[PDB]
Design a protein around this motif. Structure first.
Motif, PDB file in Angstrom:
ATOM      1  N   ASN A   1       0.808  -1.422  -0.047  1.00  0.00           N
ATOM      2  CA  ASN A   1      -0.069   0.019   0.320  1.00  0.00           C
ATOM      3  C   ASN A   1       0.880   1.207   0.250  1.00  0.00           C
ATOM      4  N   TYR A   2       0.888   1.433  -1.439  1.00  0.00           N
ATOM      5  CA  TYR A   2       1.801   2.920  -1.003  1.00  0.00           C
ATOM      6  C   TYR A   2       0.515   4.428  -0.909  1.00  0.00           C
ATOM      7  N   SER A   3      -0.885   4.534  -0.593  1.00  0.00           N
ATOM      8  CA  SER A   3      -1.061   5.613  -0.772  1.00  0.00           C
ATOM      9  C   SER A   3      -1.636   6.169   1.017  1.00  0.00           C
ATOM     10  N   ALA A   4      -1.403   7.762   0.138  1.00  0.00           N
ATOM     11  CA  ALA A   4      -1.156   8.701   1.597  1.00  0.00           C
ATOM     12  C   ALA A   4      -2.568   7.959   2.851  1.00  0.00           C
ATOM     13  N   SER A   5      -1.514   7.973   3.706  1.00  0.00           N
ATOM     14  CA  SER A   5      -1.505   7.436   4.902  1.00  0.00           C
ATOM     15  C   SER A   5      -1.934   6.039   4.653  1.00  0.00           C
ATOM     16  N   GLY A   6      -1.399   5.229   4.033  1.00  0.00           N
ATOM     17  CA  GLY A   6      -1.740   4.145   3.997  1.00  0.00           C
ATOM     18  C   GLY A   6      -3.280   3.657   4.095  1.00  0.00           C
ATOM     19  N   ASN A   7      -4.365   4.702   3.293  1.00  0.00           N
ATOM     20  CA  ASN A   7      -5.901   4.924   3.724  1.00  0.00           C
ATOM     21  C   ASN A   7      -5.969   3.182   2.313  1.00  0.00           C
ATOM     22  N   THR A   8      -6.951   2.698   2.698  1.00  0.00           N
ATOM     23  CA  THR A   8      -7.353   1.151   1.926  1.00  0.00           C
ATOM     24  C   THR A   8      -8.215   1.605   0.767  1.00  0.00           C
ATOM     25  N   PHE A   9      -9.090   2.097   0.984  1.00  0.00           N
ATOM     26  CA  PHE A   9      -9.504   2.549   0.138  1.00  0.00           C
ATOM     27  C   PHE A   9      -9.944   4.147  -0.820  1.00  0.00           C
ATOM     28  N   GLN A  10      -9.709   3.966  -1.764  1.00  0.00           N
ATOM     29  CA  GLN A  10     -10.086   5.006  -2.346  1.00  0.00           C
ATOM     30  C   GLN A  10     -10.038   5.220  -3.756  1.00  0.00           C
ATOM     31  N   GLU A  11      -9.679   6.122  -4.591  1.00  0.00           N
ATOM     32  CA  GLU A  11      -9.111   6.251  -5.985  1.00  0.00           C
ATOM     33  C   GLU A  11      -7.510   6.123  -6.376  1.00  0.00           C
ATOM     34  N   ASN A  12      -7.950   5.138  -6.886  1.00  0.00           N
ATOM     35  CA  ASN A  12      -5.826   4.934  -7.446  1.00  0.00           C
ATOM     36  C   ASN A  12      -6.019   5.055  -9.070  1.00  0.00           C
ATOM     37  N   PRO A  13      -6.683   5.766  -9.727  1.00  0.00           N
ATOM     38  CA  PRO A  13      -6.315   5.589 -11.306  1.00  0.00           C
ATOM     39  C   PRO A  13      -4.867   6.124 -11.805  1.00  0.00           C
ATOM     40  N   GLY A  14      -4.369   6.385 -11.537  1.00  0.00           N
ATOM     41  CA  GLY A  14      -3.155   6.754 -12.261  1.00  0.00           C
ATOM     42  C   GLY A  14      -2.759   8.358 -11.526  1.00  0.00           C
ATOM     43  N   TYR A  15      -1.273   9.058 -12.763  1.00  0.00           N
ATOM     44  CA  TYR A  15      -1.668  10.085 -12.614  1.00  0.00           C
ATOM     45  C   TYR A  15      -1.662  10.669 -13.813  1.00  0.00           C
ATOM     46  N   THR A  16      -1.856  11.957 -13.392  1.00  0.00           N
ATOM     47  CA  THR A  16      -1.541  12.564 -15.069  1.00  0.00           C
ATOM     48  C   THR A  16      -0.287  13.328 -14.874  1.00  0.00           C
ATOM     49  N   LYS A  17      -0.564  14.098 -15.549  1.00  0.00           N
ATOM     50  CA  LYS A  17       1.226  14.650 -15.757  1.00  0.00           C
ATOM     51  C   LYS A  17       1.888  15.957 -14.973  1.00  0.00           C
ATOM     52  N   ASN A  18       2.965  16.236 -14.720  1.00  0.00           N
ATOM     53  CA  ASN A  18       2.948  17.025 -13.748  1.00  0.00           C
ATOM     54  C   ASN A  18       2.528  18.307 -14.487  1.00  0.00           C
ATOM     55  N   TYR A  19       1.362  18.797 -13.708  1.00  0.00           N
ATOM     56  CA  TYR A  19       0.472  20.197 -14.571  1.00  0.00           C
ATOM     57  C   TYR A  19       1.318  21.248 -13.136  1.00  0.00           C
ATOM     58  N   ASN A  20       0.938  22.132 -13.023  1.00  0.00           N
ATOM     59  CA  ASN A  20       0.883  23.773 -12.486  1.00  0.00           C
ATOM     60  C   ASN A  20       0.608  23.870 -11.374  1.00  0.00           C
TER      61      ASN A  20
END
Ligand SMILES: [Ca+2]
Length: 381
Positions: A1-20
């Motif tokens: 689990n690499y989620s913030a706070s080890g939160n188990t249930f949440q949206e993990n769709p992936g990441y956009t490019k880094n924006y501004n």
């Protein structure tokens, strides 16, 4: 689990490019005292971006603990003040099975029935007068959840930004996961508030993450160790464009950190990393940091400051990138190297979630106002 706070249930769709974009925060009042005999939680939302943005592409999502979400009736907030835009509603997302989820949505951009002025790229923006309204009073909700359960699992929230053109992927770094404070939270009051620079910061937060073993900063200076590490990202949202070098009083200031007493014997090295909130392509990945110090914590059993540490410098800009003279936020990173893998740690311990705090203080240990953050790392009961 690499989620913030080890939160188990949440949206993990992936990441956009880094924006501004550079900041998004949810700041609820504490659920204490007379709040319990009512059915509302007041809040504000903070947002900042560094290059003009526009359109309905950008959507703020707010996840609330399921234990609260089941009783939420309505969530509203005002947009950033300006041209008489009207109060906004956070719309609840439902699933494909005729059930509500615990995620709500509102557009980021004010001109698209959202919160924040797209063309403004300077001081942190505030969406004021947020109210979560519940079906029942909070005392009744807390009773139903159970006092024991509120002790062992903190009531979480997560705010984050998604991009519709990127298939609702998350804008990396533009997420914050925290917990609602209640009357069981007393540490913040152990701190006396400084009169130094008391209008320079708007908010402090602490995000946590378990990082894998043997990763490093780009330059090799910083690392997580053989058993991985819990990373604390202490993020400071400015009011205006603070410069430590030009304007700080009560110097030198101290960077302060506190880790859950249970984890202290399981933490070995503690590294401080300098991190930068980029103007373009905001990126606060681990590799981006640089190690600036070895840190200590208080390890003597029974000591009043057990699990706390602090560090200063005669020029604190050597340790912290204050984004001097810019309205951009600050991130101070602490790397807590574990002495053994997390699953072995938990086995040895065998429920209460782990709590972490961070703040800046002046030379007399007084809290720089609005720099205290607290965060958690989830532990299954
Ligand atoms: Ca727990």
């Amino acid at each position: 689990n690499y989620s913030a706070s080890g939160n188990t249930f949440q949206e993990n769709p992936g990441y956009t490019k880094n924006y501004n974009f550079s900041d998004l925060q949810f700041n609820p009042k504490a659920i204490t005292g007379d709040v319990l005999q009512g059915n509302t939680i007041d809040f504000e939302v903070y947002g900042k971006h560094n290059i003009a943005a526009s359109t309905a592409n950008w959507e703020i999502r707010l996840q609330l603990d399921e234990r609260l979400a089941q009783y939420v009736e309505k969530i509203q907030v005002d947009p950033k003040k300006g041209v008489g835009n009207s109060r906004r509603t956070f719309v609840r997302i439902n699933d494909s099975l005729g059930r509500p989820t615990n995620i709500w949505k509102v557009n980021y951009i004010r001109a698209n029935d959202g919160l924040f002025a797209g063309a403004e790229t300077t001081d942190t923006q505030t969406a004021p007068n947020g109210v979560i309204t519940f079906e029942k009073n909070l005392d009744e909700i807390f009773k139903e959840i159970g006092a024991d359960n509120l002790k062992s699992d903190r009531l979480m929230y997560r705010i984050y930004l998604v991009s519709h053109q990127d298939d609702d992927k998350i804008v990396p770094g533009i997420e914050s996961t925290g917990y609602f404070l209640t009357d069981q939270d007393d540490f913040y009051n152990k701190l006396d508030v400084s009169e130094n620079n008391s209008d320079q910061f708007k908010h402090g937060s602490v995000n946590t993450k378990y990082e894998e073993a043997n990763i490093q900063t780009k330059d090799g200076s910083g690392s997580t160790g053989a058993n991985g590490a819990i990373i604390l990202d202490h993020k400071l949202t400015k009011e205006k464009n603070f410069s430590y070098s030009t304007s700080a009083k009560g110097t030198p200031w101290y960077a302060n950190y506190k880790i859950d007493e249970r984890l202290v014997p399981y933490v070995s090295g503690i590294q401080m990393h300098m991190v930068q909130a980029d103007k373009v392509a905001y990126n606060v990945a681990f590799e981006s940091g640089k190690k600036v110090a070895d840190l200590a914590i208080e390890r003597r059993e029974g000591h009043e400051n057990y699990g706390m540490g602090s560090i200063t410098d005669n020029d604190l800009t050597k340790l912290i990138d204050f984004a001097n003279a810019s309205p951009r936020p600050i991130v101070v990173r602490y790397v807590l190297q574990l002495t053994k893998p997390l699953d072995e740690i938990l086995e040895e311990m065998k429920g209460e979630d782990f709590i972490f705090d961070s703040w800046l203080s002046d030379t007399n240990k007084k809290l720089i106002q609005n720099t205290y953050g607290t965060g958690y790392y989830y532990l299954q009961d």
